[PDB]
């Protein structure tokens, strides 16, 4: 973070610091804290782990006079896949979003195994704009999320009420779920999908739906892009 702060603020370049294994960092915090006579906290981690993580994270951010930014991807690890664990809880508290990597997706073999339904970017509205990225980014993202949730619900309900009894908007949603997990989310580790290319792929996914079915897309965006 000191290197990132230099570069970004005394060099005027955007950084995107990528920390990894903040769980390992918190284990190191535990080991250093118990080197002193400090009593362990909630699950062995010290009571000031919130302060330590807050410093480490809030060392990022945009500033006024300098034309440079610092962005953080802590790439945290859940010990027992528990969001209730102190490390994920505090990191959530300080941070501004979450990207979930899912064991179910990984076992199905999808890379990256990122689970969209729990993941969200809290400052999505800022990044998805008109001057930045493309003018359909926000509407396409919201529509994709809605249809992905509907696809998961229809997949759950298929083994309960049969495939035939599902509505047309549910059969189409199952087709979208398949084409979304296996083509959109499934991305080769060495293929670069620019934001515009990924938006075009998202529109190709959304085009299986009739134009009336895409409720969350604005009519102007539907006319322009569909």
């Amino acid at each position: 973070l000191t290197t990132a702060e230099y570069l970004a603020y005394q060099t005027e370049r955007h950084v995107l610091t990528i920390l990894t294994d903040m769980s390992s960092y918190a284990d190191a915090l535990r080991e250093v804290s118990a080197a002193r006579e400090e009593v362990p906290g909630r699950r062995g981690y010290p009571g000031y782990m919130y302060t330590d993580l807050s410093t480490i994270y809030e060392r990022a951010g945009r500033v006024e006079g300098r034309n440079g930014s610092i962005t953080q991807i802590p790439i945290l690890t859940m010990p027992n896949d528990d969001i209730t664990h102190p490390i994920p809880d505090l990191t959530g508290y300080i941070t501004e979003g979450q990207i979930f990597v899912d064991r179910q997706l990984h076992n199905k073999g999808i890379y990256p195994p990122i689970n969209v339904l729990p993941s969200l970017s809290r400052l999505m509205k800022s990044a998805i704009g008109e001057g930045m990225t493309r003018k359909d980014h926000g509407d396409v993202s919201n529509q994709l999320y809605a249809k992905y949730a509907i696809g998961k619900d229809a997949a759950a309900m298929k083994a309960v009420v049969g495939e035939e009894a599902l509505s047309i908007e549910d059969k189409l949603s199952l087709e979208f779920l398949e084409k979304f997990e296996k083509t959109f989310i499934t991305q080769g580790a060495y293929e670069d999908r620019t934001v515009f290319e990924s938006l075009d792929q998202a529109w190709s996914l959304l085009r299986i739906y009739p134009k009336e079915m895409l409720n969350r897309i604005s009519p102007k965006i539907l006319d322009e892009f569909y």
Partner: protein
Amino acid sequence: AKQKMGRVMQTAAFSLAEVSYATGENIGYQVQESVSTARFKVRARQENVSG
């Protein structure tokens, strides 16, 4: 289906009454005598409706 079955039963009763009047006697005894086997049979089919 209950309404349609009521209408069809009324029509069938009228047709049976007309047939009996044309024959001049009740064919009930003959039908009972010739009841060795049933020409119509019903076989259950386990259709899967919804769940």
